[PDB]
């Protein structure tokens, strides 16, 4: 997962070439991380060893 | 910088683009992630970057 961001600024260049860009961020700022269950990982990685 | 503090992984970059009419340039800004911007310079010019 990741945290909140405000919105996607809509900027038009020349003949209608709309593009989006990351604007401001509200409220606080955090990560940017992934979570994995340990006990499942442990025995799965061990079973890899036995085979 | 952000309304509640600052962020280290992004930069706020002032732009220099064309309007919808090919006669004028206008000021703009967007935020980008640090790893996608390179300081294209012949020296340590921290105010000149390129996508």
């Amino acid at each position: 997962t990741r945290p909140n961001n405000n919105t996607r600024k809509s900027v038009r260049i020349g003949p209608g070439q709309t593009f989006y860009a990351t604007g401001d961020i509200i409220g606080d700022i955090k990560q940017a991380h992934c979570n994995i269950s340990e006990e499942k990982w442990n025995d799965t990685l061990q079973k890899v060893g036995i085979e | 910088t952000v309304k509640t503090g600052t962020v280290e992984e992004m930069k706020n970059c002032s732009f220099n683009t064309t309007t919808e009419i090919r006669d004028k340039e206008k000021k703009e800004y967007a935020l980008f992630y640090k790893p996608d911007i390179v300081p294209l310079s012949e020296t340590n010019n921290t105010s000149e970057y390129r996508l």
Partner: antibody
Amino acid sequence: QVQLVQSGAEVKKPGASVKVSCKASGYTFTGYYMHWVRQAPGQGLEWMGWINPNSGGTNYAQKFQGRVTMTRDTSISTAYMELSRLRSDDTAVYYCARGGWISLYYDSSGYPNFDYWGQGTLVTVS
Amino acid sequence: QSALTQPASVSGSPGQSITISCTGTSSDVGSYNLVSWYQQHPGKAPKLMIYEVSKRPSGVSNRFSGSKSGNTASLTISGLQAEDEADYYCCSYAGSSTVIFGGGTKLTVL
């Protein structure tokens, strides 16, 4: 135990400013948010934003737009509010209250859990 | 973006169960579950009374309950005594790192 020691009451002229502080004790203040509220004698409770103790980032509520600033000092575990451009409408009672636990992995500031509050202080404008 | 609507005051005979309601816009309480109740005795700092309307905080006796539905929520107090003579406030998360506190309501005893 978790205590919040505030400063004494004060009265100032219109247009002046007053400094309000709140001191933490009994716990590691660097892991919890801190919010503020004002209450006039007969009105509701107006909420002002939190101040992060570590990075020092601050949020402010609407209807201030900079007339109030918030700062901190981690060496003595004390927060300070600077209330500028006082008017007669600012006559009220001020309190500090401790917020939720800061987790570094998700936004938790929006959890209005205030279990420990200071004794408060009176602010009057002449 | 105004405060939450609250009654002015409530009353009740000793023992009587009392229900207090708070009404807001779905953007506040219909969206999330971040709702809390506070009570404050005149001349004292407030005390927290409710977590997650239907969750009890620590240090609270088994006299307070509540629930939410749609755009409103309420608190129920059983076994009314003189000790419950206090002011009550609702407050909830607004989104955008903001919090709403309600107008409040005064409890009277008979």
